[PDB]
Amino acid sequence: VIDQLTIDVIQETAFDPAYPLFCYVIEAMIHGQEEKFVMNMPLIALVIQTYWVNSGKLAFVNSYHMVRFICTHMGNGSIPKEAHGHYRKILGELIALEQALLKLAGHETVGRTPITHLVSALLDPHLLPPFAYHDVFTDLMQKSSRQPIIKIGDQNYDNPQNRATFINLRGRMEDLVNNLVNIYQTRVNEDHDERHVLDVAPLDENDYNPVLEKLFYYVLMPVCSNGHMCGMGVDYQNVALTLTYNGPVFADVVNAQDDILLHLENGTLKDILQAGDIRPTVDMIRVLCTSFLTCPFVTQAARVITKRDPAQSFATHEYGKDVAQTVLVNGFGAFAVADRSREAAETMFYPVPFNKLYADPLVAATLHPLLANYVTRLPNQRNAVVFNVPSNLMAEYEEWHKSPVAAYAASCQATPGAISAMVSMHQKLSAPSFICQAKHRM
Amino acid sequence: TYWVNSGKLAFVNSYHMVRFICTHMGNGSIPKEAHGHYRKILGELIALEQALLKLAGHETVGRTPITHLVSALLDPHLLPPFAYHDVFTDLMQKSSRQP
Amino acid sequence: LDVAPLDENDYNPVLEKLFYYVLMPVCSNGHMCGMGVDYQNVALTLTYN
Amino acid sequence: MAEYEEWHKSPVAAYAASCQATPGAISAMVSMHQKLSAPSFICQAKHRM
Amino acid sequence: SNFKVRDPVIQERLDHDYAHHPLVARMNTLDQGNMSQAEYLVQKRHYLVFLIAHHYYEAYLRRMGGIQRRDHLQTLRD
Amino acid sequence: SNFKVRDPVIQERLDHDYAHHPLVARMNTLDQGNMSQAEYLVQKRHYLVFLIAHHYYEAYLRRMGGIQRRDHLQTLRD
Amino acid sequence: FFVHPCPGARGSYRATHRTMVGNIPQPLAPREFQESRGAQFDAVTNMTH
Amino acid sequence: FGYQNALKSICHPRMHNPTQSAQALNQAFPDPDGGHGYGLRYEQTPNMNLFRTFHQYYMGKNVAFVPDVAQKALVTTEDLLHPTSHRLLRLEVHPFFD
């Protein structure tokens, strides 16, 4: 379904010298929630329309959860139909890649574990999508025969009996209005460093889709952007200070629709909204003000550690039977932020480098001037493969994507034949994988 | 008024005007067809230095890298032919090749 | 000589060098010349209007 | 200007006055600014240039 | 600044400029405690953020209550 | 003309035509010195260029001061 | 190479390094070679124009 | 002669263990140089502050470390097998392991 006429929309947003930073702030306050998107549903219609009419590019490309909601919800003419035909091509093919993966790995099951979990790594559930908002962890603690250590800083995480003492379960915003006074007093009185409480919204089994989120983050995104993305740490207390402490947000007499540039101060909401041309109404930011009540506190980096597959138990170490990842709680991925409004960008967001495709020095130098001072100090580390991630985050001799996966995304064209190359790349090199390919004459 | 009257675009002389048109606006001031030809200049110059930093490599001779020593479009002792900022003192603090 | 102070987040001399030496002698086919300006004579046609 | 004590040394200026202003001529200037030294010949012989 | 993000540039003292507002009296209900005068005005600003958000969400639930039968069908008679 | 650029063609004597202006009295504050009468009117013209530029920039900083809270929110009551 | 005429009445030969591939003249590195050498720069980097 | 025919020996667990390949590699080269420990192992800290994971490593960082695997991925095909590169082929042993 995806043809080269719609990667050229997706690719050219990743190389924008002026990507709107205001829409990037809306993304931080849905944080993957279904009904908190319905709250801000008419706001992002004013964003996508005034970004598709101004330049020929669309917005909200980066995260999976925003793209899924624009396809399912907002089916009317709330956003331009020519721009709507590019979102339906994304998911309509990304389902079709998931139907092809189910056709290779046959109907047979080895033991209790099916063959589909053991042939392709994209269908392997122990692979997690690198950004997590709902509670994927206790779902994987429950149904894995392979032993899933979860390291949150110092402490481990083994029994799902202990899911209340490590992972704090939120709820949707309607029910939590009663407990909401005490929730705010956990943002101030508590020291969020060395806390090891991991604030994550609860998961429902029906709307959950693990494989489609991998095919977005690991296959479609690093090809189309040619591997120029980073993980974004945010502190939400600094972000909603700017939206709410604004003047006309706080004023009463102002009507329904009294577009903001009438009523301003010299704050950062000028230079965030000056650079995007967006003129929303004041009552619509007031809905983004309500997002602060259930904002999860700090972006945390959890580390999932799973034992290798039973076809791959043989190794040298005592840790060689055991292979880890990194999964961001409460964070998300970012393209190259504009060189316009970099000074307003430093007040909200900060760069943290991740798995392999998401440690990119062109993006991370934009976000903080210390790393921009690092890469321009010595230009060896400018490359996406060579660039050094802190050992407190990852060792790259462990994760499911080693170094030459990131070398492939940086050197591709945007051809749709290279989308199907990444899927054929995640074959698992095991011995009962070889039974599947040699049967189908691959 | 130079894109409507004739089908051409202005301010092509210096790099600083072209970098400031693309990054600062992103707007509906310049017409959309006329603004797309400015982004394709800065879209191309970044794609050239993504190529030039792959072939030169990563390894170093001593303290000085080899990206400063394989092509002359990356050796900072070549300077751009129009200086408006303090390019001269920036060179002397990061150079063994005595300027 | 008068110059402005430069910021380490602002300059990147590879892009300035891939512009004046690569893209401009090609697209203009080498019809370019350095131009000197008399700045107090430029604004005298503006402020004394 | 002196031609002999310079980086750009007239046979560069003869190429640009006779281009076709083709996207292959943009890449024919970038690979034309290639240091004709000994530790660049290592880098052109790895990639079979 | 090695442990926090950079603070944003916003004009100070929203209380002295507008209010005339009931929630600014609610700001004064927060006690100082051990925090200094510079530390108090920061956390008093954060507490104003919590009051504006709780106010507009309670107003939002009244807005999404939907139109009711008896009050609307009586006005259609006229 | 072998050391300077050609002088532009602009109508002379801006003082005699308009002012009625405070900065033209500031032009007279520049002293003649050793320069002749032909040399004085040239450098008096250049000094007018400096006064117009300093005037409009000081007016520009007042223009980009941005709208303030207390003066604007009081007028919204009416 | 060139001739350096300064001392006395006789000259002596001196030399400056060419520093680039483009400073090789057109009889020894022609226009159609620099085009087909920069198009080899394209096929190795796989840059997207 | 396909891969379905040759599947009857490739699937054996002698293709899939490194231990006897780490034995034979150790006996020829008796003591390797243990320096340059980048990317080998993870180390956990109690800090959840993702600035001090981000500042401390990049604060005064000078000459940077390039590992063995990121070295191989940028080399072309005939460039690797040339005999001027020992310590790439010395640790290329068999496809599954690294």
UniProtKB/TrEMBL annotation, chain A:
Protein name: ORF25
Signal sequence interval, chain numbering: none
Automatic annotation (TrEMBL), chain B:
Parent-protein residues present: 640 to 738 of 1376
UniProt name for this protein: ORF25
Annotated source species: Human herpesvirus 8 (HHV-8)
Signal peptide location: none
Domain of life of the source: Viruses
Coiled-coil regions listed in the entry: none
Automatic annotation (TrEMBL), chains E, F:
Keyword Nucleotide-binding: no
GO annotation (BP), single: viral process
Location relative to the cell: Virion; Host nucleus
Coiled-coil residues: none
Assembly and binders: Interacts with the major capsid protein/MCP.
Role played: Participates in the assembly of the infectious particles by decorating the outer surface of the capsid shell and thus forming a layer between the capsid and the tegument. Complexes composed of the major capsid protein and small capsomere-interacting protein/SCP assemble together in the host cytoplasm and are translocated to the nucleus, where they accumulate and participate in capsid assembly.
Name of the protein in its database record: Small capsomere-interacting protein
Protein encoded by which gene: ORF65
Parent-protein start and end of this portion: 2 to 79 of 170
